[PDB]
Design an enzyme around this catalytic site. Structure first.
Site, PDB file in Angstrom:
ATOM      1  CG  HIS A  62       4.264  35.085 -60.548  1.00  0.00           C
ATOM      2  ND1 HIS A  62       3.511  36.179 -60.924  1.00  0.00           N
ATOM      3  CD2 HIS A  62       4.873  34.648 -61.670  1.00  0.00           C
ATOM      4  CE1 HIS A  62       3.683  36.402 -62.215  1.00  0.00           C
ATOM      5  NE2 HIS A  62       4.497  35.485 -62.693  1.00  0.00           N
ATOM      6  CG  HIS A  92       4.882  27.483 -54.770  1.00  0.00           C
ATOM      7  ND1 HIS A  92       4.808  26.456 -55.672  1.00  0.00           N
ATOM      8  CD2 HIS A  92       3.608  27.843 -54.509  1.00  0.00           C
ATOM      9  CE1 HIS A  92       3.554  26.257 -56.019  1.00  0.00           C
ATOM     10  NE2 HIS A  92       2.802  27.076 -55.319  1.00  0.00           N
ATOM     11  CG  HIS A  94      -0.010  30.288 -52.982  1.00  0.00           C
ATOM     12  ND1 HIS A  94      -0.031  30.888 -54.231  1.00  0.00           N
ATOM     13  CD2 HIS A  94       0.244  28.976 -53.199  1.00  0.00           C
ATOM     14  CE1 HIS A  94       0.207  29.964 -55.159  1.00  0.00           C
ATOM     15  NE2 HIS A  94       0.387  28.800 -54.557  1.00  0.00           N
ATOM     16  CD  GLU A 104      -3.208  29.529 -54.337  1.00  0.00           C
ATOM     17  OE1 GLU A 104      -2.775  28.430 -54.798  1.00  0.00           O
ATOM     18  OE2 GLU A 104      -3.200  30.589 -54.966  1.00  0.00           O
ATOM     19  CG  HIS A 117       0.562  24.922 -53.214  1.00  0.00           C
ATOM     20  ND1 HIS A 117       0.009  25.908 -54.007  1.00  0.00           N
ATOM     21  CD2 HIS A 117      -0.399  24.557 -52.337  1.00  0.00           C
ATOM     22  CE1 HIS A 117      -1.226  26.113 -53.614  1.00  0.00           C
ATOM     23  NE2 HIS A 117      -1.501  25.315 -52.601  1.00  0.00           N
ATOM     24  CB  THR A 196      -3.750  27.926 -57.632  1.00  0.00           C
ATOM     25  OG1 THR A 196      -2.391  28.081 -57.219  1.00  0.00           O
ATOM     26  CG2 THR A 196      -4.346  26.682 -57.033  1.00  0.00           C
TER      27      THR A 196
END
Ligand code: ZN
Ligand code: ZN
Ligand code: ZN
Ligand code: ZN
Ligand code: ZN
Ligand code: ZN
Ligand code: ZN
Ligand code: ZN
Ligand code: ZN
Ligand code: ZN
Ligand code: ZN
Ligand code: ZN
Ligand code: ZN
EC number: 4.2.1.1
Lengths: 258, 258
Positions: A62, A92, A94, A104, A117, A196
């Protein structure tokens, strides 16, 4: 197999297996700077990452997580909107397939290239597992990434990504200093929200920094070379692993700054 | 923090979180050769592993798994008690702390030093995930390990175990030929059963080979050097990761041989 960010298992479909996806405190959200009002009673944020003990880096299908030793108050988040002490467990990112998307949270609908994050859990509850079951269990520090100059502090992470290309790969990742991922200013917005990603639990005090960090086109390109799939499965590039903005509903976003 | 093989999270306690543990079709069992009767209508077993494509090897905190490309009918199990075609997805072992224990199945109460499980899912259901939800979803080929001469075909697995010592470690493991793990005879017992680890689903046709393979004291010793724990956590040696024999209840065990 399960949820993800593709055509058929993407954010639009998560509600099917995860009904809280349509809940009252879902994240992320658009941060509207005309309605996200300065709240002078917000304390300054205290980030203590000097003694952070990184352990490993892994591709969970992910994103990739850098995990920390959270057995002690070594790397912690305190102050700002937080009561008590929150321990860093992992960070991590995104990111997008293109520089114009990937974050996000958004700011006046503007999307950044990526979002960092840093995940912390409330020491009042004894462990992460118990903390996630509480509305004040986690604090996630959200930091926007814009394309620009290389982030020196990010380089050690980028360097090791070729060894965790596919789902389930991990590597030893010790003596990483997460302070090198921060901007200068710790001005922030804050609101009550959720994870999220599934299970989308409504346990997060979100703290999103106003100031993005700058990363190089090359550093983000290395992110986009990761795979959602395991080694030997068909290649599916790990890109666009962000959830879009969700409805604010009956929530207020507060700013630490004027 | 979850199920395992220790004093407080071991097989005796699995019923607490996993009520199917006390179900009607639980595995393993004791194979009593006085009551496990020769059934002349059992077809011979067809093991087609010539085109097996191994991918990786991993320590999941419970055992180590060698995983296979199961996108095609390349490494399959057919015939014997099985209707249709079952694809090889992974193999793994259970072993003891001492040579006198370690196998899950027993034969007239005799315990072997270890047991190899080749795991196959029924192609009728499209994927493993759908297959495990069905009483005929999986076929597990169970092979006893006795201490004796080294198993040449096992050596490649043993060799790579130092690189997956702790929980969450994996390594690339391509061009392994699982035919090297078989005995000469494919004489078997069979009965309807379950997974021997949580979630303990009752979805397995068990096929257990009469003839054990021979492994060396040194090969099994390498197994016992694995860790249940992750890297940096306190050391807990991966030994005695077997579930003891469960009640047969209203089931028949059939033998392919006289
Ligand atoms: Zn729907
Ligand atoms: Zn506006
Ligand atoms: Zn306005
Ligand atoms: Zn407005
Ligand atoms: Zn997942
Ligand atoms: Zn911990
Ligand atoms: Zn995140
Ligand atoms: Zn190591
Ligand atoms: Zn896919
Ligand atoms: Zn009980
Ligand atoms: Zn587990
Ligand atoms: Zn597969
Ligand atoms: Zn097994």
């Amino acid at each position: 197999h399960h949820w993800g960010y593709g055509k058929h298992n993407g954010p639009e479909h998560w509600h099917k297996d995860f009904p809280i996806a349509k809940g009252e405190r879902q994240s992320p959200v658009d941060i509207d700077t005309h309605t996200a009002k300065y709240d002078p009673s917000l304390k300054p944020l205290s980030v203590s990452y000097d003694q952070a003990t990184s352990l490993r880096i892994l591709n969970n299908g992910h994103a990739f997580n850098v995990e920390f030793d959270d057995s002690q108050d070594k790397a912690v988040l305190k102050g700002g909107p937080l009561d008590g002490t929150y321990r860093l467990i992992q960070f991590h990112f995104h990111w997008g397939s293109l520089d114009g998307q990937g974050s996000e949270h958004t700011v006046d609908k503007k999307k950044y290239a990526a979002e960092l994050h840093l995940v912390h859990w409330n020491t009042k509850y004894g462990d992460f597992g118990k903390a996630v079951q509480q509305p004040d269990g986690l604090a996630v520090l959200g930091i926007f990434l814009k394309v620009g100059s290389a982030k020196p502090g990010l380089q050690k992470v980028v360097d090791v990504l070729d060894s965790i290309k596919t789902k389930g790969k991990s590597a030893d990742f010790t003596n990483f200093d997460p302070r090198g991922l921060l901007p200068e200013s710790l001005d922030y917005w804050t609101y009550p929200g959720s994870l999220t990603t599934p299970p989308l639990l409504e346990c997060v005090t979100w703290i999103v920094l106003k100031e993005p960090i700058s990363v190089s086109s090359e550093q983000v390109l290395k992110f986009r070379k990761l795979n959602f799939n395991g080694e030997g499965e068909p290649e599916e590039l790990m890109v666009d692993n962000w959830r879009p903005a969700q409805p604010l509903k009956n929530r207020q976003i507060k700013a630490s700054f004027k």
